[PDB]
Amino acid sequence: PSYSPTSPS
Amino acid sequence: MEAVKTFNSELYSLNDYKPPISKAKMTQITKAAIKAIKFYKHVVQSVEKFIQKCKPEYKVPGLYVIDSIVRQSRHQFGQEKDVFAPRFSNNIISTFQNLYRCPGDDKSKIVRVLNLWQKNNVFKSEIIQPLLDMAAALEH
Ligand SMILES: [N+]
């Protein structure tokens, strides 16, 4: 799994 | 500054991975930033320096670092108490000038982040608009 700016904190 | 050195280590460790950067790695970098909150100015400086100096394929990861730190700080300390977005805002034109030295196909990823910052009020709209304008001007 790679970082997305749409993913919650 | 122990906490700052620890953050520097996590941030520079991006160079040991092929992008796209994992969620796990981004979380590690973010946690180190937050632990170093007393030295938030040094954290911002290190991120900006990374973005200035890194290889083109790490520009978008560098932006994701800003995104992750700012969003985590807003969550953990409160939107109005977050020290990171205001601090990143100071040199943000410089930062984006450096960011846009990314590979051509990465430009859309930068704009995606900007649009989310606007939609979610992560940064003030007055700050974001010139950054979007810079993206568009590059296409002309
Ligand atoms: N903060």
Instruction: Collect all residues with Cβ–Cβ distance below 8 Å to B136 and sequence separation of at least 6.
Output: none
Instruction: Collect all residues with Cβ–Cβ distance below 8 Å to B120 and sequence separation of at least 6.
Output: none
**Ligand 1 contacts CB of residue B3 (under 6 A):** no
Q: Is residue A3 a contact partner of residue B71, using CB atoms and an 8 Å limit?
A: no
Q: Does B24 touch chain A (CB under 8 A)?
A: yes
* Amino acid of residue B111: V
Which residue in the set A2, A5, A9 is minimally distant from B22, CB to CB?
A2
Q: Is residue B126 a contact partner of residue B80, using CB atoms and an 8 Å limit?
A: no
Instruction: Give the CATH number of domain B1-140; options: 3.40.50.300, 1.20.1090.10, 3.40.1120.10, 1.25.40.90.
Output: 1.25.40.90
Resolution to one decimal, Å:
1.8
Q: Identify from B10, B31, B67 which residue to disrupt to test chain A contact, counting A C-beta atoms within 10 A and taking the largest count.
A: B67
Q: What is the 3-state secondary structure (H, E, C) of B118-134?
A: HHCCCCCHHHHHHHHHH
Q: How far apart are CA B41 and CA B56, in angstroms?
A: 25
**Ligand 1 contacts CB of residue B70 (under 6 A):** no
Domain ranges across chain B: 1-140
Ligand 1, atom 1: nearest CA belongs to which residue? B82
Q: How far apart are CA B62 and CA B11, in angstroms?
A: 9
- B51 to chain A, minimum CA–CA distance in Å? 17
Method: X-ray
